[PDB]
Amino acid sequence: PTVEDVISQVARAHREIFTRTVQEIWEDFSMSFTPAVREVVEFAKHIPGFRDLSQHDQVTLLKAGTFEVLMVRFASLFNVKDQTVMFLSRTTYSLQELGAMGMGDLLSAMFDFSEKLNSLALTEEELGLFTAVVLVSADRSGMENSASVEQLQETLLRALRALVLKNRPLETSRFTKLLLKLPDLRTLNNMHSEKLLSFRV
Amino acid sequence: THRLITLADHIAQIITQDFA
Ligand SMILES: Clc1nnc2ccc(Oc3ccccc3-c3ccccc3)nn12
């Protein structure tokens, strides 16, 4: 499809789908986190070209890039000034209150990343198109057909280039600043994807 | 009474369960 078809479709799905004791915090986390992951999978279906990939490649991409998508999606839920993170159930928590989980370092890394992402002032369209780019930009190890994924990545990368130029033409490095978040996201995934979660058994 | 699992494995668990 055309670049304006990609922006319109990806941004529409982005609005439709996305937009105090240790044990109780882990139940609120689990009940917020599980639908959040499902939302990434539903958003992925609505990405022009994603369903055309083989079932294996779709699952491989979602398994590799869902943590990174959640870091971008949850970035706005981190209040850098108040030092408060809100969960998908509208419950707000202090950093200290949340220290009783494993993470600790993941939560402070998230405050820095959201702050960095905030300085860009992405419009909803831009954020939705970046979220799609993040998902298709995951490690392509174990892909039956990496070529199909690379072409899906460049289709979303061209639409993001155009949207960002349409919005802030004078800010010629806006696209660059967005591609520069990719190794930051890759470091956070490499540093924190192995951290442990607790569930009532 | 409590289960422990990495962020990656729990994500992959939700994914493989959703693709049924
Ligand atoms: Cl659940 C849920 N629903 N909304 C929010 C908002 C923030 C939040 O952060 C976390 C808190 C504890 C453990 C992991 C994360 C986390 C997971 C993936 C990517 C980034 C962070 N979890 N959360």
Author numbering:
A (entry chain A): 283 to 301, 430 to 611
B (entry chain B): 2045 to 2064
What do the authors report?
The nuclear receptor REV-ERB is a component of the molecular clock that regulates the rhythmic expression of inflammatory, metabolic, and cellular proliferative genes. Genes directly regulated by either REV-ERB, REV-ERBα [NR1D1] or REV-ERBβ [NR1D2], are typically transcriptionally silenced by the receptors. This is due to REV-ERB functioning as a ligand-dependent transcriptional repressor with heme as the endogenous ligand. The REV-ERB LBD displays the canonical NR structure composed of a three-layered α-helical sandwich, and heme binds in the prototypical ligand binding pocket of the LBD.
We determined the crystal structure of a ternary complex containing the REV-ERBα LBD bound to the corepressor NCoR ID1 CoRNR box peptide and the agonist STL1267. Except for helix 12, which is naturally lacking in REV-ERBα, the overall three-dimensional structure of REV-ERBα displays the canonical architecture of nuclear receptor LBD with a three-layer α-helical sandwich and two stranded β-sheets. The C-terminal of helix 11 assumes a well-defined extended β-strand conformation allowing for the formation of an antiparallel β-sheet interactions with N-terminal residues of NCoR ID1. Besides the β-sheet interaction, NCoR ID1 contains a carboxy-terminal four-turn helix that docks into the coregulator binding cleft of REV-ERBα LBD, known as the AF-2 surface. The ligand resides in a predominantly hydrophobic pocket where it makes primarily hydrophobic interactions with the receptor. The triazolo-pyridazine group of STL1267 efficiently fills the narrow portion of the hydrophobic pocket and forms π-π stacking interactions with Phe484 and Phe497. First, binding of STL1267 stabilized the β-sheet region (residues Gln493-Gln506) through hydrophobic interactions with Phe497 and Leu498, which is disordered in the apo REV-ERBα structure. The binding of STL1267 is quite distinct from that of heme and where heme binds proximal to helix 11, STL1267 binds distal to helix 11 and is deeply buried within a hydrophobic pocket surrounded by helices 3 and 5 and the two β-sheets strands. STL1267 binding induces an antiparallel β-sheet formation between the amino-terminus of the NCoR ID1 CoRNR box peptide and a β-strand extension of helix 11, which was not observed in the heme-bound receptor.
